[PDB]
Amino acid sequence: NYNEKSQRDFRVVTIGYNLAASRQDEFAERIYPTTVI
Amino acid sequence: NPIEGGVVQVLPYIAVMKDVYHEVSGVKMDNEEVNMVEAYRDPSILDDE
Amino acid sequence: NPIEGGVVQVLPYIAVMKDVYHEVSGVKMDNEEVNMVEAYRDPSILDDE
Amino acid sequence: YDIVSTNNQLFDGKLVVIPTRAVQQENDILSWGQFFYVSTVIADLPITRGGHQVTREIAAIPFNLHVNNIPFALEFKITGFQKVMGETQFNGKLADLKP
Amino acid sequence: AHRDSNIEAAFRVISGNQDETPMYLFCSDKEIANYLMTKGDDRTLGAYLKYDIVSTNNQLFDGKLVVIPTRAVQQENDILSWGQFFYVSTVIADLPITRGGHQVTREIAAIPFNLHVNNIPFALEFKITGFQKVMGETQFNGKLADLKP
Amino acid sequence: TDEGPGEVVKALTVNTNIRNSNNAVKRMLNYLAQLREVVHNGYNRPKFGI
Amino acid sequence: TDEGPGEVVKALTVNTNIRNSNNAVKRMLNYLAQLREVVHNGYNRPKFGI
Amino acid sequence: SIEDQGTTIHGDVELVVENETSADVSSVLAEVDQIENNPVEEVLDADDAV
Amino acid sequence: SIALIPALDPAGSNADFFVDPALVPPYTIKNEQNLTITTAPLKANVRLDLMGNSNANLLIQRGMLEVSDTIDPAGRLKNLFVLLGGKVVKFKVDRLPRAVFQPDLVGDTRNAVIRFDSDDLVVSGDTTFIDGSADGVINDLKTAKLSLRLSVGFGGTISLSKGDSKFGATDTYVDKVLNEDGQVMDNADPAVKAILDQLT
Amino acid sequence: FQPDLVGDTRNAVIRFDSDDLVVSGDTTFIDGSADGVINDLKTAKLSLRLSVGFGGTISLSKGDSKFGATDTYVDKVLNEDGQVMDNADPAVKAILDQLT
Secondary structure, three states: OOOOOOOOOOEEEEOOOEEOOEOOOHHHHHHOOEEEO | OOOOOOEEEEOOOOEEOOOOOOOOOOOOOOOOOEEHHHHOOOHHHHOOO | OOOOOOOOOOOOOOEEOOOOOOOOOOOOOOOOOEEHHHHHOOHHHHOOO | OOOOOOOOOOOOOEEEEOOOOOOOOOOOOOOOEEEEEEEEEEEEEEEOOOOOOOEEEEEEEEEEEEEEOOOOOEEEEOOOHHHHHOOOOOHHHHHHOOO | OOOOOOHHHHHHHHHOOOOOOOEEEEEEEHHHHHHHOOOOOOOEOOOOOEEEEEEEOOHHHOOEEEEEEEOOOOOOOOOOOOEEEEEOOOEEEEEEEOHHHOOOEEEEEEEOOEEEEEOOOOOEEEEOOOOHHHHOOOOOHHHHHHOOO | OOOOOOOOOHHHHHHHHHHHHHHHHHHHHHHHHHHHHHHHOOOOOOOOOO | OOOOOOHHHHHHHHHHHHHHHHHHHHHHHHHHHHHHHHHHOOOOOOOOOO | OOOOOOOOOOOEEEEOOOOEOOEEOOOOOHHHHHHHHOOOOOOOOHHHHO | OOOOOEOOOOOOOOHHHEOOOOOOOOEEEEOOOOOEEEEOOEOOOOEEEOOOOEHHHHOOOOOOOOOOOOOOOOOEOOEEEEEEOOEEEEEEOOOOHHHEOEEOOOOOOOEEEEEEEEEEEEEOOOOOOOOOOOOOHHHHHHHHOEEEEEEEEEEEEEEOOOOEEEEEEOOOEEEEEEEOOOOEOOOOOHHHHHHHOOOO | OEEOOOOOOOEEEEEEEEEEEEEEOOOOOOOOOOOOHHHHHHHOOOEEEEEEEEEEEEEOOOOOEEEEEOOOEEEEEEOOOOOEOOOOOHHHHHHHHHOO
């Protein structure tokens, strides 16, 4: 191996993934306000 | 780092997959699976009756 | 370990090579490369005139 | 009036005007619509589904209703944004009049 | 394009910040930038959208305006950056080499080691031409003259 | 697996919550369609059952 | 019964351990089958992938 | 809680009482940790191995 | 009992995923239960739901399999069937280093990739076809005291969570023709050419 | 290129596997022509997606490379609205009959 240039080991970055949703979106909430039954 | 020689990008996500039985003769599983992130633009992928 | 679930065996060696130039055409580099370990049984691979 | 926006694909150049009471008072019929929410129960149970395999299934069961109250709406289909901001509207027309 | 794309959700979900929106960069040459920078006192587009202006004199980009998103506050290996420049330290090698077999010259060579990577599949591309025929000529009274019999 | 859901189980609520907003949008648009037909036809006065 | 299993539950590991020994035997003989074919053929030098 | 429980025989029921429920699962998937440490099995450089 | 063995639908609904019976007739296998399964090698250059076409799917009820069923990444390429001179030769390649499944480094983390590249598929006078015969090309190799070294390339991907699989085979070549001693002979030799002319 | 996880550590593997290779009526040939399949495809208001597979291994120290191409198939024939047409439709059959 004349040139042992890196081929296997790499830096890894973990991409975030954070899902969220309110009971209704502000859009849906203003049109259909929530009433607890 | 010159030893690292590059970067790997790992993308975890939650996929919404349709409840489908495996076909006997199917070429490709007809599972309409979509990244949950599309539910914000097109939430119709979540419809179930 | 259950997290590993497998093993990889890495076998280093020093190879005997000829200083053959890369050909204009060729199918492969015509370099009769063998493991130096073979030299103990068949040391003629080392002969150089 | 007030402005509420969505990125839902179903709304595409569709401004709709609806009245609502300026001050909302919990269960107020004068709201254009209402969202009646009861519960979102989550249950876990190792169901042997198919009779030949067991999988623990954590399921959320929604229980709610949307109801409309007021039969009033004005629906506007609005297009042409790129045609009035991306093209000459006045000097171009005068050029078209050139003999 | 901001509506049709899912870019708003992408930043909110990936960044981990419930309230996060992209910022757009106006990538232009020097002639175009002279006009976009006019009043940079408040660089907004819509209700909440903000932008910034960056310019180059590279000939390859002459007459081009391209608008791209970026994370408002840049971090380290930020995936939400439109592209990234992955740089490894450059090496300068100095060794006397008999180059050509008949001449001996010391050659000091700087060997680059880097990659540009694009992340976001978003772009707005504008080809802007014809400043001199608009600011150096009549655009209104000349047309009225052309209507003369 | 002995370990239960980490945070992923909360995605079930997020899915439901998004569906709530989706139902609001479809319900509004489907209501407009019904209203358009009622107003299109001869129903310009308030009455029950239309 | 809500008491649980007795010591007979350890027979499951015994069955596995007996199978573990039999698997070594089957693999040994299957490997000899490889040598029979490879050494019978023209392979008298070390190389990868034979 | 369901997050802590494992395959409960009689089952578990919970009520969502939250206005919103974010779910960050970036660290939940076990393959991510394996990749972060070793995208591929670590192998020494050929010269370092001897 | 947990082996994933492709199975033929008695109705012939998935017959297009398997090698035509004319070349490799299907054969019968039985599991530990008294149930009987009909199996055959999969056709090269095929895309299919690997789990859906498995014996597990047709064992008890045709549509029993669900997303809970997954494929073990610790699989191997067991056999290749080559059409050699009009008749099929079965090559056992199960334990070779190139037969092991590998992770797909670019794409879905649960995708397994198969890359079997070998120049060491030997066909000689001692080879038999799948049906036990040794006539035709094999007999010519026997009488000429020659042995072939075939070169094959078999690739594919298996989605370990979905069951989707896509396979493909590269062009097959004869890399070497060796004499009994083990030396390479030129392909222009009338004894070598007369045999190679049959491998179209 | 990917590392060869089995075999020589210096081998670079290329496994290009894509079902999204698109041939629209706007696509032209290497000579700039839009005749033949492209013409009929364009005038039928169709789009066509190929399924291709290309694999090979390069020895990064020896320069020994082997490449192979798998059977290429037409995966989907779409309309301008993204609808996948049934291949039995004579509108798309004419194109499939040309791609032999």
